[PDB]
Each structure stands twice: as structure tokens, then as C-alpha cells.
Amino acid sequence: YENQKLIANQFNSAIGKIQDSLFSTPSALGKLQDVVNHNAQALNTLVK
Amino acid sequence: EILPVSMTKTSVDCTMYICGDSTECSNLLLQYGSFCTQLKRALTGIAV
Numbered sequence: 902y903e904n905q906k907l908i909a910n911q912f913n914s915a916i917g918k919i920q921d922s923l924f925s926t927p928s929a930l931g932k933l934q935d936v937v938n939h940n941a942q943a944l945n946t947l948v949k
Numbered sequence: 950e951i952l953p954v955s956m957t958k959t960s961v962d963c964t965m966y967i968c969g970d971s972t973e974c975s976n977l978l979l980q981y982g983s984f985c986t987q988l989k990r991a992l993t994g995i996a997v
Contacts, residue, residue: 942990946983 958996963988 923929963985968974 946987949983 956995960992960996961988 964975964978967978967985
């Protein structure tokens with residue numbers, strides 16, 4: 902109750918920074934792409 | 950309270966193991982597709 906304004910501003914800045922970090926860095930979602938690539942490699946080997 | 954954490958990293962050369970520096974053996978193995986590639990990929994994944 903003493904620092905409501907400051908805490909709200911900090912939370913807003915943090916969420917904005919998270920948005921920007923996700924937008925900029927392209928390797929954040931490495932694990933999902935790794936799973937997709939593993940499945941694709943398995944299928945490619947099977948057909949080849 | 951003891952807990953295992955890691956395993957010894959190993960890699961195996963498919964061609965040298967299957968064929969002992971024999972040209973005919975390598976030629977015959979050439980018709981079996983990319984099995985050695987899959988084995989090497991699996992071993993590297995285990996190591997990392």
C-alpha cells in the first residue's frame with residue numbers, strides 16, 4: 902500500500918522488457934524447434 | 950544421500966568397427982543406407 906505506484910510501474914516495465922526480449926532474440930524458443938527438427942529428421946531418414 | 954549425475958561419454962566409429970580397413974566390406978556397407986549416421990547422431994545427443 903505504500904509503494905503501489907512504484908510496484909505497478911516496475912511490473913509494467915518488466916512486462917515490456919519481456920516483450921522486447923522475445924521479439925528481438927530469435928533463439929529463445931530453442932527446445933520447441935529442436936523437437937520439431939528431431940521429428941523432421943526422423944521422417945526424412947525414414948523416407949530416404 | 951548419494952545420487953548419480955552423469956555417464957561416461959563414448960563415441961564409436963561405425964565403419965572401422967564393422968569393417969577392419971577392408972575396401973570390399975566398405976563397398977558392401979555402402980548399400981545399407983545411413984545407419985552409421987543415425988548411430989553417430991544418437992551418441993552425440995547422449996554426450997551433449
